[PDB]
Homo-oligomer: A and B are copies of this chain.
Amino acid sequence: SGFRKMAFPSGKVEGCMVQVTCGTTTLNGLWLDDVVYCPRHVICTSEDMLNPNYEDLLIRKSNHNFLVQAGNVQLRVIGHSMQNCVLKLKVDTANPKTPKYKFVRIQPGQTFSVLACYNGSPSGVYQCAMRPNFTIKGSFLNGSCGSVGFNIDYDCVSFCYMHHMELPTGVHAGTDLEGNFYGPFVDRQTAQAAGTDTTITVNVLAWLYAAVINGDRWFLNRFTTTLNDFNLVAMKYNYEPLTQDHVDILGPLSAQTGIAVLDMCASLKELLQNGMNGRTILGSALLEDEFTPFDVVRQCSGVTFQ
């Protein structure tokens, strides 16, 4: 029993974190095999943050202009290349701690663990979801660039995020491990803003299924809804549209609890109109949207507390 924001054990990622220095700029790098991945703006100085031409800044660098440190050991850079907004530094030593890994680009609503790092040293681990507006609500300070997000389903590390910037709203933006940004953001200091954010409807429903699995049913009602009527109502509260794909994904949780998906949608509609009336759901007084259906199945018992 219980339900918490649960991150993956971070050991497999900790053994990949390095420090990358170019000039007076220092950030984190990810050392996998003989390659170090880091944000390409490690090659930027104060005067080229608004409109840097990364191709022109990089051609002026040699391999020995990059200082890579793994703990107290200096790694020698023997090659380099830029791929989108990521710099790939080839080093003379393959990381002996390289885990089984893959690079995946995630969709909005998906969650992952973030290992926040400063100067190549891990500081903490927390969970976060890719918001519908392609930002994440993280906890990142100066020098956190190059920190990565990942999942570790079945002993394979899936890297899905690399940290690059903080927007004026206090939310965060970054790229996948191929250097392609999530959303319309750019690695420039130009005026950028996150679009209006929405609630991840399929995740709220998954978390309501988690509450039922853990023994709470106070919020259910005698009603049902069509998918059309549910979307007409939920969008008036700034909820993301629920698709037939989301209904299908919720199938296993619906089967375990005996609560039809559209019946849980009717519960959600009533929760939006009434509030909780002094009650909590899984310890929360608001509707939580950063647990996916897969996260619920991972953490919850396969037996409902009937």
A→B interface (CB under 8 Å): 1-12, 14-15, 115-116, 122-126, 128, 137-142, 166, 170-172, 214-215, 280, 283-286, 299-301
Q: Which B residues lie within 8 Å of A142 (CB)?
A: 301
Residues of B within 8 A of A7 (CB): 7, 124-126
Q: Is the CB of A11 within 8 A of B10?
A: yes
Please give me the residue from chain B that is nearest to A128 by CB atom: B4
Chain A: interface secondary structure?
loop
Contact in complex: A9, B285 (CB < 8 Å): no
A283 to B288, CA, bound (A): 10
Give me 21 A-to-B residue pairs in the complex whose CB atoms sit less than 8 angstroms apart, sorted by A's number: A1-B140, A1-B170, A2-B138, A2-B139, A2-B166, A2-B172, A4-B126, A4-B139, A6-B139, A7-B125, A8-B124, A8-B125, A9-B14, A10-B10, A11-B12, A11-B122, A142-B301, A170-B214, A170-B215, A284-B285, A284-B286
Q: Is A9 touching B170 in the complex (CB atoms < 8 A)?
A: no
Chain B residues in 8 Å Cβ range of A11:
9-12, 14-15, 122
**Complex Cα gap A79–B201 (Å):** 55
Copies of the polypeptide in the assembly: 2
Given A2-B140, A11-B15, A14-B9, answer yes or no on A125-B125 (Cβ-Cβ < 8 Å). yes
Minimum distance in angstroms from A207 CB to a CB of chain B: 13
**A141 / chain B contacts, CB cutoff of 8 Å:** 1, 300-301
Q: Which residue of B lies closest to A276 (CB)?
A: B285
Closest B residue to A167 by CB, please name it. B1
A137→B286 contact, CB < 8 A: no
**What 4 pairs between A and B have smallest CB-CB spacing?**
A11-B11, A285-B285, A2-B139, A6-B124
Bound-state CA distance A277–B14 (Å) is 42
Q: Complex Cα distance A300/B142, Å?
A: 11
Q: Is the CB of B6 within 8 A of A9?
A: no
Q: In the assembled complex, which residues on chain B have CB atoms less than 8 Å from the CB atom of A299? A: 124, 139
**Whole-angstrom CA separation of A125 from B7 in the bound complex:** 5
Q: CA A299 – CA B139 in complex, angstroms?
A: 8
Please state if B124 and A3 are interface contacts (CB–CB under 8 Å): no
> How far apart sit A2 and B283, CA to CA, in the bound complex (Å)?
21
Q: Which residues of B contact A12 (CB under 8 A)?
A: 11
A79 to B: closest C-beta gap in Å: 29
**Minimum distance in angstroms from A295 CB to a CB of chain B:** 10
Known: A1-B140, A1-B170. A10 touches B125 (CB 8 A): yes
Contacts of A15 in B (CB 8 A): 11
